[PDB]
Design a protein around this ligand. Structure first.
Ligand SMILES: *[C@@H]1O[C@H](CO)[C@@H](O[C@@H]2O[C@H](CO)[C@@H](O[C@@H]3O[C@H](CO)[C@@H](O)[C@H](O)[C@@H]3O)[C@H](O)[C@H]2NC(C)=O)[C@H](O)[C@H]1NC(C)=O
Ligand SMILES: *[C@@H]1O[C@H](CO)[C@@H](O)[C@H](O)[C@H]1NC(C)=O
Ligand SMILES: *[C@@H]1O[C@H](CO)[C@@H](O)[C@H](O)[C@H]1NC(C)=O
Ligand SMILES: *[C@@H]1O[C@H](CO)[C@@H](O)[C@H](O)[C@H]1NC(C)=O
Ligand SMILES: *[C@@H]1O[C@H](CO)[C@@H](O)[C@H](O)[C@H]1NC(C)=O
Ligand SMILES: *[C@@H]1O[C@H](CO)[C@@H](O)[C@H](O)[C@H]1NC(C)=O
Lengths: 53, 122, 111, 96, 43
């Protein structure tokens, strides 16, 4: 299985204080594609036919 | 802030071999989206939207099918379109606009320039 | 496909109140109600935003009018009017698959 | 070492070492997580609406361009922020 | 409290308390014996 996340979406950081460096989400640059996974089709057919026997 | 230079000489009987080009501005050209609105006499005038960088649309409305062909160039910071096989009930393409952020659905926060060019029967 | 609403080409006697409505182009809208904004133009100018983000007054225009919004059916309001206010106001709201407006105004002060 | 001429009964589902793998990972997880930074004061009320090209994607879902007030370094100063959160991280209470 | 053998101390009492949200307060109503309350030196 291959699984990816397209939007690399740079971050920022502020300070709660004293000494609590909080990280939070920044901003999108580029297109937007949601996360997904590819899978080999015929092999998934083959092992599913294998398990049902 | 900077308006958009346009160019239209659309005076051609119905073969739509007719290129129309947009321009650039002083703002950044990437990380936003654009659209296109024409001008009809008093009937709400067009709805043709476009994409961001590599976005997932090529035609925004129906009834433009096979005739729309919007493109975009990030390099020279200027897009253009081609409207092949032009029908009647059609004046010209007129305006360019910008989508912008911090809105909710969509908005046309700036307006480049409107260009009038009647197409039929010179 | 929509079915927009406007009463007519309007008029005003400079009396601070002018409410025009577009009730239901289509069905209702969800929790992120997403009804977009009203534009203006006059024959000597390109179109221009009035309101932004379905509720609140634009940074760039002075603070002298607003509009109401509730779910599907709503209208505008206005608050003391003057010379450059009489214009053409278009009503686009719907943002899912098409972008649409069919409504429109022609407003002019009464002599 | 291979064995010879030996049988033995075997039963899973009653083995004790599955719980000892269960108990220590729980004690490992919190112990690795405890002495780093705490945050109580974040969950403050907030108004929120979606992001603009969220409607311009295959993912027409939820991004929620969002903002709130947060206490700063000094106790008598507040600050304004702007951030993003998914729908599965936020819920409303039952005007913006 | 005045209607009992125990004519003593119940002190039906109330205050402000922070809620789960940091920008919201709330009103409560409760009871405390005088052996668990004492004043400072108007109500
Ligand atoms: C998982 O499956 C998807 C489904 O096909 C794969 O997506 C495909 O990815 C390629 C590589 O980016 C895309 O091709 C690109 O097209 C642009 C168009 O200008 C071109 O400039 C690029 O050079 C490239 O050729 C392709 O369109 C895309 N297909 C889709 C989205 O349907 C994906 O690669 C697979 N693997 C992973 C790890 O996600
Ligand atoms: C995404 O990755 C590219 C790779 O070169 C990088 O330049 C960019 O800063 C990253 N972040 C974005 C587009 O927000
Ligand atoms: C997943 O990615 C690896 C990377 O080398 C590739 O070899 C493999 O074929 C991919 N699997 C797919 C596309 O099912
Ligand atoms: C799996 O492969 C068999 C052939 O071995 C075929 O008959 C069957 O339709 C396939 N099923 C799917 C879900 O691809
Ligand atoms: C933040 O605090 C200021 C202080 O008056 C207030 O005006 C503003 O509405 C607050 N914003 C939020 C999101 O709480
Ligand atoms: C609780 O807070 C409100 C806020 O003004 C105040 O009016 C009230 O007197 C307070 N009550 C007590 C018991 O502190």
């Amino acid at each position: 299985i291959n699984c990816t996340r397209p939007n690399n979406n740079t971050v920022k950081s502020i300070r709660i204080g004293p000494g609590q460096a909080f990280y939070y989400f920044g901003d999108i640059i580029g297109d937007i594609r949601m996360a997904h996974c590819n899978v080999s089709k015929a092999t998934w057919n083959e092992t599913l036919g294998k398990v049902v026997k | 802030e900077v308006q958009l230079q346009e160019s239209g000489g659309d005076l051609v009987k119905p073969g739509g071999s007719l290129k129309l080009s947009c321009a650039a501005s002083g703002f950044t050209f990437s990380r936003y989206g654009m659209s296109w609105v024409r001008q009809t006499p008093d009937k709400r005038l067009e709805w043709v939207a476009t994409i961001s960088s590599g976005g997932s649309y090529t035609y925004y409305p129906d009834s433009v099918k096979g005739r729309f062909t919007i493109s975009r160039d990030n390099a020279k910071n200027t897009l253009y379109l081609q409207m092949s096989s032009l029908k009647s009930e059609d004046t010209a393409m007129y305006y360019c606009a910008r989508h912008g952020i911090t809105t909710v659905g969509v908005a046309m926060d700036y307006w480049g320039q409107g260009t009038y060019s009647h197409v039929s029967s010179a | 496909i929509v079915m927009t609403q406007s009463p007519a080409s309007l008029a005003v006697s400079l009396g601070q109140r002018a409410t025009i409505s577009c009730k239901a182009s289509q069905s209702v809208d969800y929790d992120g109600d997403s009804y977009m904004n009203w534009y203006q133009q006059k024959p000597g100018q390109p179109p221009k935003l009035l309101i932004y983000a379905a509720s609140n007054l634009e940074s760039g225009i002075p603070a002298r009018f607003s509009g109401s919004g509730s779910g599907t059916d709503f209208t505008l309001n206005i608050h003391p009017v003057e010379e450059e206010d009489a214009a053409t106001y278009y009503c686009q709201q719907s943002n899912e698959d098409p972008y649409t407006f069919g409504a429109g105004t022609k407003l002019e002060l009464k002599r | 070492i291979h064995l010879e001429n030996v049988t033995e009964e075997f039963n899973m589902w009653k083995n004790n070492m599955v719980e000892q793998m269960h108990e220590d990972i729980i004690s490992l997880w919190d112990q690795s997580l405890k002495p780093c930074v705490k945050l109580t004061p974040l969950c403050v009320t907030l108004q929120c609406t979606n992001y603009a090209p969220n409607l311009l994607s295959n993912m027409r879902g939820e991004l929620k361009q969002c903002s709130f007030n947060m206490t700063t370094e000094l106790r008598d100063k507040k600050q304004k922020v702007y951030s993003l959160f998914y729908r599965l991280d936020v819920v409303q209470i039952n005007s913006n």
